[PDB]
Design a protein around this ligand. Structure first.
Ligand SMILES: C[C@H](CCC(=O)NCCC[N+](C)(C)C[C@H](O)CS(=O)(=O)O)[C@H]1CC[C@H]2[C@@H]3[C@H](O)C[C@@H]4C[C@H](O)CC[C@]4(C)[C@H]3C[C@H](O)[C@]12C
Ligand SMILES: C[C@H](CCC(=O)NCCC[N+](C)(C)C[C@H](O)CS(=O)(=O)O)[C@H]1CC[C@H]2[C@@H]3[C@H](O)C[C@@H]4C[C@H](O)CC[C@]4(C)[C@H]3C[C@H](O)[C@]12C
Ligand SMILES: Nc1ncnc2c1ncn2[C@@H]1O[C@H](COP(=O)(O)OP(=O)(O)O)[C@@H](O)[C@H]1O
Ligand SMILES: [Mg+2]
Ligand SMILES: [Zn+2]
Ligand SMILES: [Zn+2]
Ligand SMILES: [Zn+2]
Ligand SMILES: [Zn+2]
Ligand SMILES: [Zn+2]
Lengths: 142, 590, 75, 662, 142
């Protein structure tokens, strides 16, 4: 019984050590991977929502058609968005109208990285390959 | 303290004690490694020695996990159980460890001393994790080789500008140049403590070293020196980021009439934009490092980090960029000690500038839009992993040629290393081919290129100049003075000195020789700018005097001689030793 | 559960923004905090989705902060 | 006025002789000359009025240049309270040679050197008086959002939670704050106005409240008798720059802690209190701020008040339910003591809007004097006055460190002093007694049919406005009347009343409207009746007390009152955490065991969505243990020998938590 | 075994005494550190004092005692003004010099809430939306 008592004391201390080491290892592993885990969780939750505006802005961000400021909610407010190629312009921009964030915007001002004003008539398959891409389009919420 | 097995990336908590780098190993892989090799020490969270009052057993098949600790055969608690058994070695995550078949190459990588040549050709054609582990242990072995260099001491001081040296009897003597430093001792009774950081270089006359120190302490005769050690950090990033072929250029933007000089390489610029990483292989002086600056002029908005393994190559790249790029947006990043004298004409050491030039070793962790690695021959897989870890990027461009001289590889002393095993980039270049290839010499005259298209390149290069007849091949015996453990050829230097006052247009030709000793000692007798062949690569000069110091396997190396001669721009005089080497080239009479 | 999925996604999004040192720019952090708090105090799902678009535009505007292509290829 | 002027005694006497000329009780402009605490309140009430005509720069600590080992310090040798007048220290050493640890602590705690060395401040973001800027730049402290426990949320939504239209929905979150939060919360001290009280009425309410606090015992204790709960807590400014409270409770022996305590009985030590933003889960997006008081104040306030405070926390069945657990039948016992033989019982509960920031200084001084009535043998009159002065200088009207800047707190209780909940309980009881007095006096008197209550009203008016000495017989009679017809249950700002509905309808006992009137003219707040509840049926219990609803269940064979929380609160605590490692789950199974203990009484709720929260927590505990054992068996190859975690997903471990056997 | 019991007590009380001694030595070597830190803080604050102005205002005091709230207000050489919006800035300290506390101050620096330098030309009615309010202006007594 004395031998069994010291056996149980030894195995109790073994369980103490196992639990403490597991807690330490898991805590340091979770605190180490806090940025990438949070970003992956955020994009998982974003995909699960499957909102049409969120999916639109994310798909445009993958192509590089990201905004330059916070997308505004008030009507007739200003959105600045960089378009990096004619492909992203052809789908989003129809005439003077700009489809973005599941909303329609009125194109106001197109500039280049030289800040040169470019008319909407100059964006085409032939003249743009000489332009200073990426364009930056400033539009108003309609 | 858990980790990931090197050759299977399972979870583990074991490491090999005998290995220099102490790599993590899963249970199956650790059993396969220890039961077959001579390594018999395994470190868990606690080391696997025997926990008797006093006992020293490390072999893992002898031990048991008894009671609450690891105990040997006749010290164990009466309740067992064996550690190294059941085809595994007992550790954490025991029943999730999948082994491999790469425990046949890992044994060779861990065991080998990097003396033969096959160790490098097995350290560069293995799997991707072993490509990193082998580079890590190779750097570790190269560092620990310095621990076998003889302890110095001072004989006396007649002249305080030139120290006297005395090596310990019975040990090898390290070479005397800038790359090696020393730190002292005063072990008499009475201060076994360091006395400063010193460095050495030989003197021409008698036995003397014209030393240098970080402080101004004198050595009472008992004070002495020992070469210190550079601990080698661990590395994680892959040697080459996996390639993806984009349909169209992403993240980069073209320009409006880039220039009238770079109008030929436009297709290669677009190809660079299309692919994740690109490789440019070309014979020397064909437009490789003048391709990178043209690329910068083609992607003006793209932040670019230029890097190289050497200092005298990135300095030439900096000068070229100053000649072409806008000088306001440049930088130059130098290490804290700055052993060599670097380029001070831009705003030095500003990492967040648009165009940033640095060596591989001093790269700071940052981002970019395209990173241009240059002279990949000088770079080992450690440098590739370093540049792939510190510098994030959208596009990678590796420019260089395998036929130039490779990295030093001081440990290698048996056999020769073929180009296709210099590193992963050169292996890619030689296996499937470069992504961009330009063979036409735009720098060197017709004579020297028409001779180098016979030594190294199999009659491939046409070129563009006219042979100015200022290409000279000299016959001179050149008696040997093996002085600094690198040879010095005093009579060849005498030939040069006696026929450098007969050449009024050669008063500024750079002096090139394979041996650093003669290359450094020539500065007194002729006063020309001096340069070793290894660092001359990547830089051009208007006139070159090359001296084959002694006949060996180092100075008669066709790659070294080819990278030496092709730095000339209008003419080069070279004095040769090998009756063959002087005959394979076609130069003037003398 | 769609209203409560938006209110947790905004929490994770603001945690990501705080990790990206948006907190250093007080003018931007004030707008992010306002949007996050107005999403949490929401009764209508359309208002919460519009404010979620505005709050995600902060994450999408900073080009060098996150790798959108790598993050969206893990799904 | 001259800026250097601080002694307006002659001006106060001229004001008193000009307006209250025939008020025949003696007035002391400086309350250091008062005869007792009944005279401190009277003269302090007059000083509250008279201090509104003097410059605000003349109040606060009174500094003086002393010399220690030849170097000139500038240290506070007094104070000018708006309520207590001018107070001078009794132990002032103009020439010293060495500074002991006690004197070093005293000279580091007070704001004389910090304000005298810092820059001048003009903070236009607040209307509060800004004293100084200690650093060279302003600090804008933000509040982080919470950490999302996605595993628990996925488990919850897999169980049918958070559906559209469901009764249980997430309403408690971690609300983030910008840099302008800590200075926007402190600006709420703009709701503290100088309120002059009815002194002939307050002096009777004080006697009734002291009757309420008669069952306890208190007095000074030694430094070896002080027990501190957690020593790893902040020591306030500037002491948090070198360690926690453990450092200063270890570095000071009992001898120089008793020396400091005896120093505070003859000298006033001003103290800086930090404003700390609170990072916790809440249902509203307004930032919450706590007051980190210096260790030099907390130590002496513990040594002064802790005997009485522990005596209150150890009494069962009283009006002030502090120290009474809600487990093991403690809630049922509390609710049965509230229903203490009232005739026509209706339950009532009210709210104090901006309770800690709108509380008048007169009522805080009243609470401090009521707590200090236990020191009738350990302390002299001057000792008690200087302890009150230290309380006012360190708690009531202090220097506040808010973002690296020292401001002046206009008044109101700080939520970080040693006696916060207990002084708040005294304030709550005082307001309730005042409401009852006003209700009884504002009744007609010719309409009161009961001849006993008419004579009670007559004698109440006599004891208020026609009597200057305490009539202990009538104070006992009114206390008996209040206990019989207005039974109370107080936890520091929560109160359940079990009043007589017939008397309150006849106006003989306080109602909600009486509390609204009293809080209007005595708290400078408006108490909307949308936050005050009335319960006509006792079988449902109080609507809400300490954020817990009450329901009557059949436990065993008898009916008992069980408290259940908001299910939104428990689900929000499960889903949102304040640390990244509380998201692992397997690391924190006790975290969910405690939440299941709190959420057990929901299983008796008639709404099934409420009853499913406890089962959700039990199932998540079981899943957490399953995956914890899986991960442990993976990290090794052996299971744990002893595992007693099976009892945490059995409902008996939680059922026994609300059974009166313990 | 009877003397082994005394040995158990000996070792137990010896370890307890050693732990108590270690704890007491640690708490006595941590007391000197905080004593030195408090002394250095007090003496640096002494060295910060504007001795001439403080001496003047304290010699003007009849009893030698002055309110603390006037110590900066009459002797501090540097004033920090925290301003939440543009109208307040125009009211209190518009221009390079202004008056507060019956003294004359000259603007030496302006920073925003981000601790970035702001020039006096950038604080305008139309440039107000582009500034990270509040603005902290630092002025010196003239
Ligand atoms: C005897 C009589 C009623 C008892 C008490 C109550 C109030 C007292 C007066 C005022 O307090 C102060 C006033 C100024 C000077 O003090 C002396 C004169 C005055 C007129 C007092 C006279 C006298 O003493 C009074 C009437
Ligand atoms: C004896 C005990 C379990 C009982 C058993 O009989 N196992 C037999 C093996 C399991 N089988 C069935 C696969 C065979 C064995 C199994 C796993 C062992 C622990 C970990 O490894 C390492 C850990 C960290 C440091 O090293 C310090 C000790 C620690 C705590 C170890 C203690 C002890 O030594 C453990 C609990
Ligand atoms: N398109 C070109 N037209 C004329 N000269 C060129 C052109 N491209 C390169 N050169 C010349 O050829 C040389 C090649 O230099 P560099 O690119 O450094 O060669 P390497 O890359 O082999 O070191 C440059 O000095 C430059 O003067
Ligand atoms: Mg080159
Ligand atoms: Zn090994
Ligand atoms: Zn493995
Ligand atoms: Zn042994
Ligand atoms: Zn009085
Ligand atoms: Zn007392």
């Amino acid at each position: 019984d004395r031998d069994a008592a010291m056996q149980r004391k030894l195995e109790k201390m073994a369980d103490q050590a196992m639990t403490q080491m597991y807690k330490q290892a898991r805590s340091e592993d979770k605190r180490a991977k806090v940025t990438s885990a949070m970003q992956t969780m955020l994009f998982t939750m974003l995909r699960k929502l499957d909102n049409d505006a969120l999916n639109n802005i994310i798909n445009n961000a993958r192509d590089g058609c990201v905004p330059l400021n916070i997308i505004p909610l008030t009507t007739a407010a200003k959105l600045m968005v960089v378009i990096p190629d004619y492909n992203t312009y052809k789908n989003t921009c129809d005439g003077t109208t700009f489809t973005y964030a599941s909303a329609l915007w009125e194109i106001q001002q197109v500039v280049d990285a030289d800040s040169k004003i470019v008319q909407l008539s100059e964006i085409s398959m032939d003249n743009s390959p000489n332009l200073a891409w990426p364009l930056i389009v400033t539009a108003l919420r309609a | 303290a858990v980790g990931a097995c090197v050759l299977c990336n399972s979870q583990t908590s074991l490491r090999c004690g005998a290995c220099i780098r102490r790599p993590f190993l899963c249970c199956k892989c650790c059993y396969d490694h220890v039961i077959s090799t001579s390594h018999k020490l395994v470190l868990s969270v606690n080391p696997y020695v025997c926990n008797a009052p006093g006992c020293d057993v490390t072999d893992v098949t002898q031990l048991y996990l008894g009671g609450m600790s690891y105990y040997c055969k006749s010290h164990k608690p009466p309740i067992s159980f064996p550690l190294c058994a059941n085809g595994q070695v007992f550790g954490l995550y025991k029943n999730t460890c999948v082994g491999s078949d790469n425990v046949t190459d890992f044994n060779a990588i861990a065991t080998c001393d990097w003396t033969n040549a096959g160790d490098y050709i097995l350290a560069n054609t293995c799997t991707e994790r072993l490509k990193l582990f082998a580079a890590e242990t190779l750097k570790a072995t190269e560092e620990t080789f310095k621990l076998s260099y003889g302890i110095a001491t001072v004989r006396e001081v007649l002249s305080d500008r030139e120290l006297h040296l005395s090596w310990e009897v019975g040990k090898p003597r390290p070479p005397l140049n800038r790359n090696y430093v020393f730190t002292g001792y005063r072990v008499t009774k009475n201060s076994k403590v360091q006395i400063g950081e010193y460095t050495f270089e030989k003197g021409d006359y008698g036995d003397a070293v014209v030393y240098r120190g970080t402080t101004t302490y004198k050595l009472n005769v008992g004070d002495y020196f020992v070469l210190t050690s550079h601990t080698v950090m661990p590395l994680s990033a892959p040697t080459l980021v996996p390639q993806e072929h984009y349909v169209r250029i992403t993240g980069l933007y073209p320009t409006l009439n880039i220039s009238d000089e770079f109008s030929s390489n436009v297709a290669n610029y677009q190809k660079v934009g299309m692919q994740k990483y690109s490789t440019l292989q070309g014979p020397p002086g064909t437009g490789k490092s003048h391709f990178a600056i043209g690329l910068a002029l083609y992607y003006p908005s793209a932040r670019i980090v230029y890097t190289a393994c050497s200092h005298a190559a990135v300095d030439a790249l900096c000068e070229k960029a100053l000649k072409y790029l806008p000088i306001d947006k440049c930088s130059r990043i130098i290490p804290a000690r700055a052993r060599v004298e670097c380029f001070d004409k831009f705003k030095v050491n500003s990492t967040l500038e648009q165009y940033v030039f640095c060596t591989v070793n001093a790269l700071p962790e940052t981002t970019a839009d395209i990173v241009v690695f240059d002279e990949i021959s000088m770079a080992t897989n450690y440098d590739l992993s370093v540049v792939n870890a510190r510098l994030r990027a959208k596009h990678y461009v590796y420019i260089g040629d395998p036929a130039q001289l490779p990295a030093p590889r001081t440990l290698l002393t048996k056999g020769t290393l073929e180009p296709e095993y210099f590193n992963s980039v050169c292996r890619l270049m030689k296996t499937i081919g470069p992504d961009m290839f330009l063979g036409t010499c735009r720098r060197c005259p017709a004579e020297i290129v028409d001779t180098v298209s016979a030594l190294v390149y199999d009659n491939k290069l046409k070129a563009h100049k006219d042979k100015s007849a200022q290409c000279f091949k000299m016959f001179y015996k050149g008696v040997i003075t093996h002085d600094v453990s690198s040879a010095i050829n005093r009579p060849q230097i005498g030939v040069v000195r006696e026929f450098l006052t007969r050449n009024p247009a050669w008063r500024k030709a750079v002096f090139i020789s394979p041996y650093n000793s003669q290359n450094a000692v020539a500065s007194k007798i002729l006063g020309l700018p001096t340069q070793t062949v290894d660092s001359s690569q990547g830089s051009e000069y208007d006139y070159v005097i090359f001296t084959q110091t002694t006949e060996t396997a180092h100075s008669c190396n066709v790659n070294r001689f080819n990278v030496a001669i092709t730095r000339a721009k209008v003419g080069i005089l070279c004095i040769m030793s090998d009756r063959d080497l002087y005959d394979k080239l076609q130069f003037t009479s003398l | 559960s769609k209203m409560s999925d938006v209110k947790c996604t905004s929490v994770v999004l603001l945690s990501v923004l705080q990790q990206l040192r948006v907190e250093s720019s007080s003018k931007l952090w004030a707008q992010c905090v306002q949007l996050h708090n107005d999403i949490l105090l929401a009764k209508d799902t359309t208002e919460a989705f519009e404010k979620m678009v505005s709050l995600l535009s902060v994450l999408l505007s900073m080009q060098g902060a996150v790798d959108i292509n790598k993050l969206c290829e893990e799904m | 006025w001259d800026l250097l002027k601080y002694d307006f005694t002659e001006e106060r006497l001229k004001l008193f002789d000009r307006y209250f000329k025939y008020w025949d009780q003696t007035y002391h402009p400086n309350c250091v000359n008062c005869l007792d605490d009944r005279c401190i309140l009277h003269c302090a009430n007059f000083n509250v009025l008279f201090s509104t005509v003097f410059p605000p720069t003349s109040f606060g600590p009174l500094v003086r240049k002393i010399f220690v080992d030849g170097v000139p310090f500038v240290v506070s040798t007094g104070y000018h309270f708006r309520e207590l007048g001018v107070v001078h220290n009794q132990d002032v050493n103009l020439h010293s040679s060495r500074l002991s640890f006690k004197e070093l602590l005293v000279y580091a705690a007070d704001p004389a050197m910090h304000a005298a060395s810092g820059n001048l401040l003009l903070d236009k973001r607040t209307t509060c008086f800004s004293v100084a800027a200690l650093t060279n730049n302003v600090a804008f402290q933000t509040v982080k959002p919470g950490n999302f426990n996605k595993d628990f949320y996925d488990f919850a939504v897999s169980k049918g939670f958070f559906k559209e239209g469901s009764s249980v929905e997430l309403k408690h979150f971690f609300f983030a704050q910008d840099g302008n939060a800590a200075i926007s919360d402190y600006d709420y001290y703009r709701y503290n106005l100088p309120t002059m009280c009815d002194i002939r009425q307050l002096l009777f309410v004080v006697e009734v409240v002291d009757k309420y606090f008669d069952c306890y015992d208190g007095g000074c204790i030694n430094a070896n008798q002080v027990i501190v709960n957690n020593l790893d807590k902040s020591a306030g400014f500037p002491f948090n720059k070198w360690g926690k409270a453990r450092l200063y409770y270890d570095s000071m022996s009992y001898e120089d802690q008793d020396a400091l305590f005896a120093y505070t009985k003859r000298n006033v030590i001003p103290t800086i209190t930090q404003m700390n933003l609170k990072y916790a889960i809440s249902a509203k997006n307004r930032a919450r701020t706590v007051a980190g008081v210096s260790i030099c104040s907390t130590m002496t306030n513990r040594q002064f008040h802790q005997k009485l405070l522990k005596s209150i926390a150890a009494t069962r069945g009283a009006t002030v339910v502090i120290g009474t657990s809600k487990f093991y039948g403690g809630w049922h016992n509390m609710l049965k003591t509230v229903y203490s033989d009232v005739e026509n019982p209706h339950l009532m509960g009210w709210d104090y809007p901006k309770c800690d920031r709108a509380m008048p200084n007169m009522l805080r001084i009243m609470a401090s004097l009521v707590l200090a009535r236990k020191h009738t043998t350990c302390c002299s009159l001057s000792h008690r006055f200087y302890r009150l002065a230290n309380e006012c200088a360190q708690v009531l009207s202090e220097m506040v460190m808010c973002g690296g800047s020292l401001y002046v707190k206009p008044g109101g209780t700080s939520s970080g002093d040693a006696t916060t909940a207990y002084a708040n309980s005294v304030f709550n009881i005082c307001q309730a007694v005042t409401a009852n007095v006003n209700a009884l006096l504002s009744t007609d008197g010719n309409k009161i049919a009961d001849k006993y209550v008419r004579n009670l009203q007559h004698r109440l008016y006599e004891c208020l406005y026609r009597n200057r000495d305490v009539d202990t017989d009538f104070v006992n009679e009114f206390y008996a009347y209040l206990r019989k017809h207005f039974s109370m249950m107080i936890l520091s700002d929560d109160a359940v009343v079990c009043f007589n509905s017939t008397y309150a309808s006849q106006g003989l006992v306080a109602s909600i409207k009486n509390f609204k009137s009293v809080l209007y003219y005595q708290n400078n707040v408006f108490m909307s009746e949308a936050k005050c509840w009335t319960e006509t049926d006792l079988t449902k219990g109080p609507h809400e007390f300490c954020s817990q609803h009450t329901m009557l269940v059949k436990q065993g064979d008898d009916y008992v009152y069980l408290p259940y929380p908001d299910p939104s609160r428990i689900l929000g605590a499960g889903c949102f955490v304040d640390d990244i490692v509380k998201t692992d789950g397997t690391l924190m199974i006790e975290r969910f065991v405690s939440l299941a203990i709190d959420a057990y009484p929901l299983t008796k709720h008639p709404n099934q969505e409420y009853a499913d929260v406890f089962h959700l927590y039990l199932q998540y505990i079981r899943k957490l243990h399953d995956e914890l054992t899986g991960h442990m068996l993976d990290m090794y190859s052996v299971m744990l020998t002893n595992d007693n975690t099976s009892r945490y997903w059995e409902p008996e471990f939680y059922e026994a938590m609300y059974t009166p056997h313990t």
